[PDB]
Structure 1
Amino acid sequence: SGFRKMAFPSGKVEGCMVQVTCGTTTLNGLWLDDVVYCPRHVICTSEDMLNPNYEDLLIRKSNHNFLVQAGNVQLRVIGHSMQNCVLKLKVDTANPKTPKYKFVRIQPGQTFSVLACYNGSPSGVYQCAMRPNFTIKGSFLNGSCGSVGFNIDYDCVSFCYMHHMELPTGVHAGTDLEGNFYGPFVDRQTAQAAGTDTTITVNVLAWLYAAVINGDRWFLNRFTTTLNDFNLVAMKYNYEPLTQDHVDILGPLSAQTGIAVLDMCASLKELLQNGMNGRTILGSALLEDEFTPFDVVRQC
């Protein structure tokens, strides 16, 4: 029993975190086989950021401009190149702690764990969702660039996020591990801001199921709604539309609790229209939307 925001064990990723220094900037890098991945703005000075031509700055660099430290051991950089917004520093040593890994890009609404790092040293691990507006509500101080997000499946680490910058509202923007930003953000100084966000409906539903599995039942009722009538209510309250595919995905959880998806939607409609009247669900007074259906099955 119990339900917590649970990250994946981070050990497999901790063994890949290194420190990359170029000029006066030190940030974090991901060391897999004989390649070190890090944000390309490591090659920039502060005054470069207005309109950096990264093609410029990189040709003006050479291997010895990059100091790579794995723990106490210096790694010798033997090659450098750019892929989109990440830098690939080829080193002379394959990381013996390289786990089986994948570079996958996630969808808004999916979750992952973040290993927050400073100077190549892991500091903490926590769960995140990719928001519908492609930001993440992380916890990052200056120095955390290069920290990565990931899922683990059996033995295989699927890296999905690298941290690049904080936006003006305090949320976070980054790339997949091929260097392509999530969302309409760039690694140069602009007034870029997070777009408007929505609540991830299928996740809220999944979390309600986690609540029923854990003995919270006060919000259940005898009503059902149609998918169309629920979606009218969702749009009013700034929730993603619910699709039949979401309904299908919630199936297992529906079967385990004996509460039909559209039966649970009726409860969600009541919660949105009436609030909670001073009660809580799984220790929260808000509707939580950063647990996927998979996260719930995983933990329950």
Structure 2
Amino acid sequence: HHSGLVKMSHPSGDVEACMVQVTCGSMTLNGLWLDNTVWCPRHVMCPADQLSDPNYDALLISMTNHSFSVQKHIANLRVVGHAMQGTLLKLTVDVANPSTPAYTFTTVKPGAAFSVLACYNGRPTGTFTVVMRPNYTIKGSFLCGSCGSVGYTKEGSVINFCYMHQMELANGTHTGSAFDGTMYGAFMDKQVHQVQLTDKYCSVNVVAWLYAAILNGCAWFVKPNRTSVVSFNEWALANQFTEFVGTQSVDMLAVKTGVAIEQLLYAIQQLYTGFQGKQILGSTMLEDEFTPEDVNMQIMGVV
């Protein structure tokens, strides 16, 4: 039986119309064009043999407006101002993007899902959805030249930009910047080995998945036994789970299914030790890549 759950992305058209190519010297990557501003990773300024431990403040001083070439592929956009904010550049260009959507900047939290538009040379090439991991990486799909690819969520017609791609870590995961220029997590935009926090199971998303299973008639793991949020969270800290924080979206799943959160918190504690040969929605391990919102939207049609 298929759960009706897929990795679903927002339609990407609004964001495709904002993607540009930025070139500075022998470096080329993607930028995001909104109003009269082009956002891009600051390491576009950096020569290759300096990518490890660059001095970006000196690089910035060395640049003029004419150092930066911005091209749209579907136009040259003339740069008329340049600034550095954290790990991003803010380039001011003479033409406002006539396809600028309604947008905000936001910061995405661990366990939360967002859509990524993967781009190369200013050209959108694919889209996918990821969850921000508890160690502030994402399990994405990015190659050389993908920096400046953007992540976003959507509420209504409004695009909430939350991620600009910067780097691949040694374990194959990825990280980037928020649009205030901070990197997610404790990462720096330098090509040096960095410590990676350990990842954890996102407990709220495992709960959501267990509810999706119940909504598909799969409930063998539901017992009357219960674990308090407080008790579960103490356990979580000792077993590489995030602490659980309920939301209105989780509450809706509890109401529709008639199964209490605390019953599924107990179930997780038991399922963690093992599935004993049974499966849940085709899986023999806990799944934390689907959010309560995904389950409410894709299975129940609920906002």
TM category (shorter chain) comes to over 0.9
Contact 2:147–2:166 (Cα < 8 Å) also in 1: yes
Structure 1's consecutive aligned runs of 4 or more residues displaced over 4 angstroms after TM superposition are none
Give the aligned CA root-mean-square deviation in angstroms. Answer: 1.7
1:299 equivalenced with 2:292 (yes/no):
no
| Equivalence for 2:85 | 83
Deviation digits for residues 28-71 of structure 1 (CA, Å, limit 9, x no counterpart): 10011111100000000122233322121112111222111111
Gaps of 5+ in 1: none
Deviation digits for residues 89-131 of structure 1 (CA, Å, limit 9, x no counterpart): 1111111111100100111221111111111111111111111
- Counterpart Cα distance in 1 of 2:277 and 2:26: 52
Alignment of 1:84-123 (within 5 A): 84-123=86-125
- Counterpart Cα distance in 1 of 2:34 and 2:205: 32
Contact 1:222–1:263 (Cα < 8 Å) also in 2: yes
- Counterpart Cα distance in 2 of 1:8 and 1:50: 35
Gaps of 5+ in 2: none
- Counterpart Cα distance in 2 of 1:200 and 1:259: 20
Alignment of 1:179-258 (within 5 A): 179-243=181-245, 246=246, 250-258=250-258
Contact 1:168–1:193 (Cα < 8 Å) also in 2: no
Deviation digits for residues 131-166 of structure 1 (CA, Å, limit 9, x no counterpart): 111111111111100001100111000000110011
Deviation digits for residues 254-276 of structure 1 (CA, Å, limit 9, x no counterpart): 00111111112222222112x22
**Alignment counterpart, residue 25 of structure 1, candidates 21, 24, 27:** 27
Q: Count the aligned residue pairs.
A: 297
- With over 3 angstroms needed to count, the CA separation of the structure-2 counterparts of 1:219 and 1:53, relative to structure 1, is same
| Equivalence for 1:269 | 269
- Counterpart Cα distance in 1 of 2:86 and 2:49: 21
- Counterpart Cα distance in 1 of 2:20 and 2:189: 21
Alignment of 1:109-148 (within 5 A): 109-148=111-150
Contact 1:38–1:88 (Cα < 8 Å) also in 2: yes
Deviation digits for residues 223-246 of structure 1 (CA, Å, limit 9, x no counterpart): 222334433443343111224xx2
| Equivalence for 1:290 | 289
Contact 2:209–2:295 (Cα < 8 Å) also in 1: yes
Identical counterparts, % of pairs: 51
- Could you tell me which amino acid in structure 1 is paired with residue 9 of structure 2? A
- Counterpart Cα distance in 2 of 1:41 and 1:199: 32
Contact 1:167–1:193 (Cα < 8 Å) also in 2: no
Contact 1:101–1:159 (Cα < 8 Å) also in 2: yes
Give the 3-state SS of the residue equivalent to 2:114 in structure 1.
strand
Give the 3-state SS of the residue equivalent to 2:152 in structure 1.
strand
How far residue 282 of structure 1 moved from its aligned partner, in angstroms, is 2.6
Give the 3-state SS of the residue equivalent to 1:139 in structure 2.
coil
| Equivalence for 1:13 | 15
- With over 3 angstroms needed to count, the CA separation of the structure-2 counterparts of 1:198 and 1:71, relative to structure 1, is same
1:155 equivalenced with 2:157 (yes/no):
yes
Deviation digits for residues 69-91 of structure 1 (CA, Å, limit 9, x no counterpart): 11161111111111111011111
Give the 3-state SS of the residue equivalent to 2:44 in structure 1.
helix
Give the 3-state SS of the residue equivalent to 1:267 in structure 2.
helix
How far residue 249 of structure 1 moved from its aligned partner, in angstroms, is 5.1
- With over 3 angstroms needed to count, the CA separation of the structure-2 counterparts of 1:66 and 1:235, relative to structure 1, is same
- With over 3 angstroms needed to count, the CA separation of the structure-2 counterparts of 1:248 and 1:78, relative to structure 1, is closer
1:260 equivalenced with 2:255 (yes/no):
no
Contact 1:247–1:261 (Cα < 8 Å) also in 2: no
